[PDB]
Symmetry: D3
């Protein structure tokens, strides 16, 4: 596993954004072979989305042939509601890049048949073959996507009931009223994520310190689904300073020297 010990969130977004750009450009997407990108929502990727937009405007990357798939979406929340993941994605990303509407894949949290929705989503990923790079975040309780503690490490896209603690964390976007945040959400499973060619998790803040420790130093278990990365052949964790506070000295020492050159880019 690769862990990139950075200091600031701004640095994390810059690093993470440059990485996505390098992968796309190295891949050389065409209409027949698009680059499939997995994407998250929340506060963590904000700097990354900003960096990417900056790079696109500078003519450094084009998304004309990039296909995207988002990790999840709230159930029952209106599409046009400012806090739906659909709104989030467009406001913060799509509205500023040249990605065509065909290439955008979001889970329909208002599908008449929830079960058909999840099944079709998996089918969509399969049709393109494989997600090349899946970017995401980690929850306070260690959940990846919305695979809350006790989710199967082999799970597929399905409807999931959120842990009260997650709703409380997410209530920031709902005027701090827990009663506002949806009790359920459609999410890609751990198995889905594991099928991706490369997984890149952004970790920012002290609230994620126990989660990061669980992912790096812990054992594989379904209570902290983020630990599934230990079984992934190409996992990367980009973190800032405060999120590494629960790690051992030797753990952070090892990674710091591995990435020494890799992060001096500034």
């Amino acid at each position: 596993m690769r862990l990139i010990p950075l200091t600031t969130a701004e640095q994390v977004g810059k690093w993470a954004a440059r990485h996505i750009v390098n992968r796309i450009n190295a891949f050389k997407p065409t209409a027949d072979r698009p680059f499939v990108l997995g994407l998250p929502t929340g506060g963590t990727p904000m700097t990354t989305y900003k960096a990417l937009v900056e790079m696109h405007k500078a003519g450094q990357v084009s998304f004309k042939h990039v296909v995207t798939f988002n990790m999840d979406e709230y159930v029952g929340l209106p599409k046009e509601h400012p806090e739906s993941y659909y709104s989030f994605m467009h406001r913060n990303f799509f509205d500023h890049v040249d990605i065509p509407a065909e290439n955008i894949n979001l889970l329909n949290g208002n599908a008449p048949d929830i079960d058909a929705e999840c099944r079709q989503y998996e089918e969509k990923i399969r049709s393109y073959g494989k997600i090349h790079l899946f970017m995401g975040g980690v929850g306070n309780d260690g959940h990846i996507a919305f695979n809350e503690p006790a989710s199967s490490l082999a799970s597929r896209t399905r409807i999931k009931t959120l842990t009260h603690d997650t709703r409380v964390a997410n209530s920031r976007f709902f005027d701090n009223d827990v009663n506002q945040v949806p009790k359920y959400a459609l999410t890609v499973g751990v198995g889905t994520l594991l099928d991706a060619e490369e997984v890149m998790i952004l970790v920012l803040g002290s609230q994620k310190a126990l989660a990061l420790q669980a992912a790096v130093e812990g054992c594989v278990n379904h209570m902290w689904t983020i630990s599934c990365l230990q079984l992934h052949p190409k996992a990367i964790m980009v973190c800032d300073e405060p999120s590494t506070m629960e790690l051992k000295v030797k753990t952070l020492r090892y990674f710091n020297e591995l990435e020494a050159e890799n992060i001096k880019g500034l």
Copy 2:
């Protein structure tokens, strides 16, 4: 993973039995496509077997096209010995249902060539393709089937030497004399179980509290093979009240509300 927090063993058997019935009926087994069912022995499934028999007598299910495979069988114990798993199954189940003798698959604990026996068993499962629902229990030390601590999480059907503690637990059926219980037994491996489409573990009693905690809150490891369910995409654990005593408040809180409707059937 789904955990059904129930109060009484009677409730567990009722829930578990109704689930098996719903799956079979929803499947609609025919002579060409039978429903393959995995089954355990011991004290835990007693209420389930009783419920099933009740439902069959009421004309709610028929086993005329259900194929069964049992988890294990003692080595060296005579078939007709009242405590052989062969005797157990017929006395407690088969003797009361309309399952034809062809559809019954039990491990021969007295096979001249133990190695050929296990290999043929695996072959038998393969010929039908896949076990649809595998029901089982959990040992005090967390063993699933007779996969004692240190059994490979990728293991196949083989001969296994029982842990002294297991023999002591099983001595209840041998007039409480440990010297009576067989030292070895043929058992399906963790890999075998994992190949099943759905796994349903019944957990009853305080003796299983540490085991249940290990399965739900613990990490995957071969010392408590029951933890292999964390890697299974369709695992269900039906428990009574005393078995949930080692869980965290939040863990039992989460599941109780998930199953709230699902268990109100009474």
Copy 3:
């Protein structure tokens, strides 16, 4: 998992060597179907290599049709340097057996293109199909091959940066000067090892007690890659007396009686 509790290193080598011999002879290798053997370097296998050489000289085994693959090799160290794994293997083994030069596969730690080297190595294993028996050791920090803590449990052959602690341990062969030991090394991944038909780990000494405990009693995690054996269907650990000091009484009791006959050969 099988654990062979032995007393002395001499006993370990004897047991381990006899096992390799039995497997080869039972396999009956020919030019078209060779027996593929995985091999380690270090101090642990010394008695095993000696035993094997003794057995070959006695006409008990021939390596004329055995193909070998070594776990790793230092990067940047000259081939002819007495402490390169290439030198180690020939001095301690190849120089005394009848294995033809074609059948010897070692990682080129001085390849102009490191990435091509690792890829070709994997290809080499694939061409023969599958490694039949992979013998190895365990590091103080639990690393198998040079898959240091935090290596992916699904990893493939690649270049790896060694943990300072490993270099310190390996400095014994470099006149006790840490500055002498290479900072990097080419190594087969955990995924590579897992693809082998049977894995046999030799464990000798008190320095490996925490590692052995992690492998046998611990949970699967990438910090102690040796724990990957829990997911392997055919893993064997041969140990001496001092390495079992961190195990539980019951754990060593169980294995001692399982192998009672199996080790009385003396």
Copy 4:
């Protein structure tokens, strides 16, 4: 140890206030034998102070013969700053009850001689003999008073350097600017609290869930100073619902049966 499991902060405040009132009234304090109350500051005790004031105005208690000692104070914060513990204690309690000015004891965070201030504080406690009841809170990191992780369990009143997490936690009262929160504070040591006849800690909110678990279910250690209560012959922990989430079901169950009557004021 007693743990009063209530649901809301309002209840915790009523139980706390009620318990203090009963101790005082049962004590029948006089000028020659006053009751000695140790007190905390922070968000936790807010409901308890409100209830105490109420009961006082209602003629249920008189602090005419009660001497108070506060746990801590910030170093270098002006005594008139609305956020100094001195201000907190007057604004929220002293300004509303009938306690003599000479009966109030507070650590002076602006003392020219810090060691002298602290020593004289312990000596002022000694002159009275002992603190009959010491009320307190618990920090996110499990700190009792400002005895941060790694504080001696036999510590006395001395100055302490506040952990970054505590400063961030306390920034709440300094308009969310950590830079405004004092870096140091004078606090009573663990040994000083252990010398009280009875200790009562108030735990509210999910943020203290880990602290509560460490206190109740953990072992004695100086990283979570709240663990010192396990050594106290008379410790009570009053908690709301969210703070008990990290506890085992059995643990909560026990305390629920235990305090059934004692918590039904209604």
Copy 5:
């Protein structure tokens, strides 16, 4: 801490009895300076009482000048009920030795004033000065006396509410009906036991394996009150084979070398 590793309960009884006899005889008690023996009830001490009686009848000890104090008694159980600790102590020991009626001390579980009964009990111990040897057992949950999980490590004689597991465990003596086992009991606290000159705990059976491990290898904590012995300058634990199963090989090894001579009475 000394741990006497024996094989059988019979041996444990002989070592225990022998050790008590040697202390008394070495003490040379007189009416003006009696020996003070603290004693337990339950299945564990049965072999020790048998051996004590024997040695007495054989003229090896005289309890003429020995004062006894028992650890606990059930609240609300008739003194004449065959299962009251009073009955147990007479049936199994007092009725067979030469100890004066005035030298026997037992807690009255039917005392109208429970706090008074308990206080006077501590005062009766104080009048004699100190308990020279306090013999005891250990509960499945690690309880010493009836100091259930979460009992203060500095606790005194007081009433305690018995854990459901203890009641279920003790149902053995109430014809397996938990409803017949008293819900409360008067017991000496942890601090009271810590005040004895020497403490000797008897551990028998695999059911105590976890309690023994917590005692010997765990940390000091109030959930497993037997951990208080780590704080005692003179504690001995006499155990049989099954009770040591959860211990590390090294731990058992150490004690075996340590007590070699001391356990070879033969």
Copy 6:
């Protein structure tokens, strides 16, 4: 607890020596009130003794009025053997400073009456009142003095049987032959060290990394006797870089900010 995080053993020696010198000079010892220094042997204190001698020769301290008490001594080792602690203390310290022969206190490992030797040793400490500063080291297994795992935390000076790991560790000084290392030794108990006004432990090398972690981050337990310092009101641990590797980043961070000024002698 204070932890001085330095980089090298040379620095640790300078900080240690400097701290001892300041205590003595600040104490202003006289013949009627001498300073009492407790001292250790082994490789760890080598740099501290060198620096003490230096400072002495430089006229910075006088041991004319300093009484010394050493922690331990080997049983059955000739007082003139170059490896006896007596020899160590003279060769490395006494032979170079101005301390009176009557001010030196050492345990006699060849005492005909071991209990008497040990008792009189505690009595000699009592006559002086108390040890003002007790300097020590830590064993790989976390032992303070020779209080091996499972030693009472309230232990006094007595004889102890050395753990095999300690003997192997100490073989360094007996030309690597464990058979030459004494099996027993007289040592001050945990309670004796806890009675010192201040304790200062020296930790050097990666081999002590686990001992340091147990001491700083672990819980109080008798398997790692160094954990007793958590109970000491005045304990300091001086460490080099390698010994801190098992600590959490946050833990090291805290101590670094804490000791910044205090470690910059330069």
